[PDB]
């Protein structure tokens, strides 16, 4: 969803001061920007300081759709910041509830839960490990065989981020039975899915010998070879990289 | 540390989350979401308004306050998620931050290192951008700073870089960081050697090629000697890393 900044915004003239030659104007504008950024982070931190996270995690068990969905947006949002903010989400016990919400008959709830997991798995290796431990992988994989393309795309993005951890985190993806589904996804009519399936296999390929062979066993060499000649240009530029590192 | 103002609505909202009343639960979640949406849109408005490239340009300012103030703003943005980190790199920050790494002024150097740490706490391509910008040669050279505040920030940065994939871990090894990392185990500072242990354990998360390089540096010798330490918490981390070589 795109927005317009309000008409009374001071930001444009503030940006002009930064680019100016005056150096009183330069100093004034950097101070105002530092204030805006400090204020914005502090409002986010105050919510965490307030003890909101564990109470929001509780509300993930709400029978009410409205409440569960808003509490889910809030957590996803926090988990989209730095590592420290993901840690707070994890510490509040979000993961088991987030993993459980992958069984939700609601397609809107499933997608928001998948986006939350992606955010958390975009952090450090031990935080991706936490996700793995919570048993996210068995559900993520079965969700790769989904008729719903929009769900598939987010489940795929969540695996890629897990697949961008250490070798042991990558191996957990392999052990979960992810490759057959990923390789099949290189036959996707939808181009955007192909590219994320590509980037997922590319992230796995950044592992050691064991991870590479597993990808060769799944039949990914054959595909990337006779895929390096697809209609699109950047789908060839990324399949060339996904084939070259497997060396 | 700071206090929130007495008029803050947050405590009554938190209690509304934990209540049995669904209406109060729903009013509180919507309000928390609103607050979070607002803060994140304040930060994005600064980016959408084209500030970053201009702040990067002010990293080469002859004025002490300006340079310092711009570096904090850049550092602050880089402490968010990957999307915000990328905007900083796109703005051209890394070259300027690396050049600032060899500046007379001590606090400027420290903030420069803090900034680079923030950037290296993102994804692998982001950490690789730090490496391609030439950060490592300077970083290792700072591992024996007579200033210990500067030593601990430089350590943090290397841990972050070494917390990437195998390609970035090998780069740290290739830059000759292991000997100095090992020598920081037998050092008086209990907070520093802990960060050096964090650092070494992160390398030990790589492959065999990475695991063996640490061994040739004399890690296993000084890792086992750390079970005779006064502190109980160091005794755990030394083991969690010593055994991390299965
Ligand atoms: Mg191989
Ligand atoms: Mg809202």
Put simply, the chain B residues between 1 and 30 with a CB less than 8 A from any chain A CB are: 4, 8, 10-11, 13-14, 17-18, 22, 25-26, 29-30
Residues within 5 Å of ion ligand 2, judged at the Cβ atom = B 33, 37
Burial class (CB in 10 A: 0-12, 13-18, 19+), B75: buried
Put simply, the chain B residues between 27 and 66 with a CB less than 8 A from any chain A CB are: 29-30, 32-33, 35-43, 45-46, 48-51, 54-55, 57-58, 61, 63, 65-66
Contact A168, B205 (CB under 8 A): yes
B237 CB-near residues (< 8 Å, 6+ apart): B194, B197, B198, B201
Task: Give the chain A residue whose CA is nearest to the CA of B43.
Answer: A37
Technique behind this structure?
X-ray
A82 and B CB contact within 8 Å: yes
B7 CB-near residues (< 8 Å, 6+ apart): none
Query: Residue A44 and residue B46: Cβ atoms within 8 Å?
Result: no
Query: Residue B36 and residue A44: Cβ atoms within 8 Å?
Result: yes
Residue B218: Cβ within 10 Å count: 14
A199 interaction partners in chain B (CB closer than 8 Å)? none
Q: First CA to last CA across chain A, in angstroms?
A: 41
- The helices-and-strands tally (H runs, E runs) of chain A is 17, 0
Burial class (CB in 10 A: 0-12, 13-18, 19+), A23: middle
B144 and A CB contact within 8 Å: no
Residue B136 tokens, joined: 């490592």
**DSSP conformation letters of B87-121:** HHHHTTHHHHHHHGGG-S-HHHHHHHHHHHHHHTT
Task: Give the chain B residue whose CA is nearest to the CA of A67.
Answer: B26
B189 and A CB contact within 8 Å: no
Task: Give the chain B residue whose CA is nearest to the CA of A169.
Answer: B205
Which ligand is closest to the CA of A214, given by its number?
1
Distance CA A38, CA B160 (A): 24
DSSP A30: H
Three-class DSSP category at B146 = coil
A193 and B CB contact within 8 Å: no
Residue with tokens 């970053």: B52
Domain that holds residue A212: 1-247
Residue A74 tokens, joined: 């809030």
Instruction: Give the number of domains in chain B.
Output: 1
Residues within 5 Å of ion ligand 1, judged at the Cβ atom = A 209, 212
Three-class DSSP category at B62 = coil
Distance CA B54, CA B61 (A): 11
Three-class DSSP category at A133 = helix
Alpha helix ranges (H) inside A92-190: 94-100, 107-120, 125-133, 136-142, 149-162, 167-175, 179-184
Which ligand is closest to the CA of B40, given by its number?
2
- Among the listed residues B197, B169, B167, B198, the one whose alpha carbon sits nearest the alpha carbon of residue B183: B197
Query: Residue B48 and residue A12: Cβ atoms within 8 Å?
Result: no
For the domain that residue B155 is a member of, what is the CATH number? 1.25.10.10
Task: Give the chain B residue whose CA is nearest to the CA of A64.
Answer: B22
B167 and A CB contact within 8 Å: yes
């Amino acid at each position: 969803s795109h927005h317009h900044h309000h008409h009374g915004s001071e930001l444009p003239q503030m940006t002009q001061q930064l680019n100016s030659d005056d150096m009183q104007e330069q100093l004034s504008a950097t101070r105002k920007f530092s204030q805006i950024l400090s204020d914005g982070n502090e409002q986010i931190q105050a919510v965490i300081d307030a003890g909101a996270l564990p109470a929001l995690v509780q509300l993930l068990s709400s029978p009410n759709e409205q409440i569960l969905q808003e509490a889910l947006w809030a957590l996803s949002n926090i988990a989209s910041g730095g590592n420290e903010q993901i840690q707070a989400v994890i510490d509040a016990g979000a993961l088991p509830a987030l993993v459980q919400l992958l069984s939700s008959p609601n397609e809107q709830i499933l997608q928001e839960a998948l986006w939350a997991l992606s955010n958390i798995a975009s952090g450090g290796n031990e935080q991706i490990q936490a996700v793995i431990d919570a048993g996210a992988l068995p559900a993520l994989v079965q969700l790769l065989s989904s008729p719903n393309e929009q769900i598939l795309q987010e489940a795929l993005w969540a695996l890629s981020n897990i697949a961008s951890g250490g070798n042991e985190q990558i191996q957990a993806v392999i052990d979960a039975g992810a490759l057959p589904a990923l390789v099949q996804l290189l036959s996707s009519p939808n181009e955007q899915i192909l590219q994320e399936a590509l980037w997922a296999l590319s992230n796995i390929a950044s592992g050691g010998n064991e991870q590479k062979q597993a990808v060769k066993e799944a039949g990914a060499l054959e595909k990337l070879e006779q895929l390096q000649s697809h209609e699109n240009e950047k789908i060839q530029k990324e399949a060339q990289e996904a084939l070259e590192k497997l060396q």
